Write a protein that binds this ligand. Sequence first.
Ligand SMILES: *[C@@H]1O[C@H](CO)[C@@H](O)[C@H](O)[C@H]1NC(C)=O
Lengths: 104, 438, 49
Amino acid sequence: GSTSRNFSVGREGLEYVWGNHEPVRVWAQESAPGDPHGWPHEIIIHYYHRHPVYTVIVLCGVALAILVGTASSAACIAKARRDCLTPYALAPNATVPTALAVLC
Amino acid sequence: FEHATTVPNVPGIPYKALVERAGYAPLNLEITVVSSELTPSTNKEYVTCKFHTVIPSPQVKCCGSLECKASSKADYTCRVFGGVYPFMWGGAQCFCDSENTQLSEAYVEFAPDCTIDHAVALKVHTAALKVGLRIVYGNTTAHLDTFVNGVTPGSSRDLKVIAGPISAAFSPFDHKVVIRKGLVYNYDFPEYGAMKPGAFGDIQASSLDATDIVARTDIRLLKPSVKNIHVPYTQAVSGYEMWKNNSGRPLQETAPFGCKIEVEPLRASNCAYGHIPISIDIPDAAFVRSSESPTILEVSCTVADCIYSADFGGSLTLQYKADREGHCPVHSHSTTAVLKEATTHVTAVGSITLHFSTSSPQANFIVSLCGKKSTCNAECKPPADHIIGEPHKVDQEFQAAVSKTSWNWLLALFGGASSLIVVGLIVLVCSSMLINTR
Amino acid sequence: FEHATTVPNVPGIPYKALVERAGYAPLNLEITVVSSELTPSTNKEYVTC
Ligand SMILES: *[C@@H]1O[C@H](CO)[C@@H](O)[C@H](O)[C@H]1NC(C)=O
């Protein structure tokens, strides 16, 4: 009849031979929306249309890294804080009040 | 002097490289592959086509018996019958009231148009590649052609060249391949000796004019019912034609890597895969030395615009203050920027506009005029025409595919996390070793 | 290629712009409306005098 036929072409290329014509080769380059130099969110609506299974794992990697860094540093320095409460019961005063203002 | 490099294997696009020695001037070296055929070593087994059942005029023996022999022609089938009484036009062709016998034999052989319409069944293995490439050294050119195993040089006028072995050695063919009328297929035909009735490989011959052919297509005879004389027979459908109906698309348009497959030497021209290593020697007649070469001073490149595409998108201007005038090589020492202008003509206070093409989202590479380097940053934009009829001259390298800012965000975002872990560890150690001594 | 631009609707006064391709020199582009007609869809009912 008369029909539209969607195809898909990556970086490596594609040819099509319609009837008794000669083959017509076509290579496809990137025009993903956004901008790799604009600082906001549009820097990763670009790298999602190009290689989508890599951007999600690298974003989850850095989000897991920042949460584990914040949690591990907070827990370890809180343990190191509680390992320095040798003056208790307040019957003498605190040793360095500037250090207690830093800590408490 | 000897210089070795590893070009990509895509027919058509060059690979820019330099050579340099102690006390000598640099020299440009672009080489490209213009034809690359992949021919395998074939071995023919048999030649087959559509058959033609030949039935001779049936014997009849009157008031007697008749038993039949064994013959060597293809699919010979005999059968005798007791008590027939045949009529030709003048009736009663036998003087024997229902005690006579007849013979009925049939066999099979080639049709008279199989000298054009025959399929050939081959068996291919160990495809070895050959390259026609174009060496350009020191404003001189040379055309040559070499085998690509790493031991066989093919020279051209004092220019030796060792093509090392290709990384991914393969062929587009299987172990078994069949050809009719210039169309290669990719089929699994039966061995010469195992005939299946009503499938491909039905007639067999080592050559199409041979005498001792082999067939098995179940000629079975039937008892003559009617009084007129003829020989009833049935036969399976021709396996060559009911293959030819279901042949599928040929391997001229289903083979990978852009291979164009011809038939008459059974080659596979212009396949695009892998990398090849090349080791050439350059004669000393082209290596000009630095005592007479035009040396260079005060170079500072800068960019004006950059797209990253397959066409030459970027364009950079350049300043240079040479003391003398001549021809100095221009090159970029990256692997993501290929530079179009191979050579230039320098003057005292002039300026050169160049062209390049990239795939990295930004350009941080160094260009080189006549011996010494120069650096210049850029900022490249995505293009709009996202289908073009020209292949990419570069690769991506998968680390420079991120810009400065997209690299910079995530690297700062977990550098801060690692640094706060380090400072928590050191304040932990400091407080612990302060208190445990008490 | 095609270059999008919103010219204002004031008859006579041009709106200059230049276009830019990579590797090619920039090219100017002047756009001006010179006369604009506004025609509706007309349905006649009657005639009186
Ligand atoms: C070609 O190379 C030779 C090598 O000495 C050089 O003298 C000559 O000027 C070059 N020719 C051109 C046109 O650049």
